[PDB]
Design a protein around this ligand. Structure first.
Ligand SMILES: O=c1cc[nH]c(=O)[nH]1
Ligand SMILES: [Cl-]
Ligand SMILES: [Cl-]
Length: 223
């Protein structure tokens, strides 16, 4: 049951899609039975929902997990600490991190500290077939992650949304019910690079927006 898979707040928030989450478990088992693989590891698929729902203050949305074996870890854009070199998307994120915040380059690609601090690193689709980008689109995850985003937007708490998966016209309606939701626009993605992403100041703007809504800023600093 959801209560065993995710954090208590998320289990309640995702109750309307509990049957669909069970169906995705069936889908993944059927993939292995059919001789196909999936990433991330089963134990990491729902990892973004293992950090507390009530404490989320920034939503960073991606589209699909990394398709390269050993990259996807269940937090959008993150990689395991032993992964090197970083994927291009993450290298671009880190360049912006250094430019926006003035911090040196991180030691590795693990974004766990952001998750701990209330940054929800959510992909719209939570699995992928290795080496086959975007291969699990339309398999059932979109309803689950829509429920998640709508539940976040309905909280009385502040939220800043950062849209790094394009798809803004799909996502913005999900964030509309919100009373204390600010969406960063425009919506370059990390691979936009110098055609809008670099200089987008997503981290410092998120903090400016949070503080303007009466919330504490995120400490973005990575080790
Ligand atoms: O959208 C994206 C792109 C790369 N990696 C992710 O986890 N999400
Ligand atoms: Cl495969
Ligand atoms: Cl990439």
């Amino acid at each position: 049951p959801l209560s065993e898979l995710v954090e208590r707040g998320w289990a309640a928030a995702l109750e309307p899609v509990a049957d669909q989450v069970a169906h995705m478990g069936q889908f993944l088992r059927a993939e292995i039975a059919a001789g196909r693989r999936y990433l991330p590891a089963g134990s990491n698929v729902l990892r973004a929902f293992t950090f507390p729902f009530d404490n989320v203050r920034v939503l960073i949305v991606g589209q699909d997990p990394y398709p390269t074996p050993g990259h996807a870890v269940g937090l959008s854009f993150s990689v395991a600490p032993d992964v090197r070199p970083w994927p291009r998307s993450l290298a671009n994120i880190f360049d912006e991190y250094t430019a926006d915040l003035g911090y040196p380059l991180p030691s590795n690609g693990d974004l766990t500290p952001w998750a701990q601090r209330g940054v929800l690193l959510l992909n719209r689709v939570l699995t992928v077939r290795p080496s086959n980008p975007a291969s699990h689109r339309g398999k059932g995850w979109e309803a689950v992650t829509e429920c998640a985003i709508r539940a976040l937007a309905a909280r009385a708490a502040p939220l800043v949304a950062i849209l790094w998966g394009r798809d803004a016209s799909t996502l913005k309606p999900m964030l509309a019910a919100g009373n204390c939701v600010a969406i960063e626009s425009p919506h370059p993605s990390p691979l936009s690079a110098s055609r809008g992403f670099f200089g987008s100041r997503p981290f410092s703007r998120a903090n400016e927006l949070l503080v303007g809504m009466g919330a504490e800023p995120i400490d973005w600093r990575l080790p």
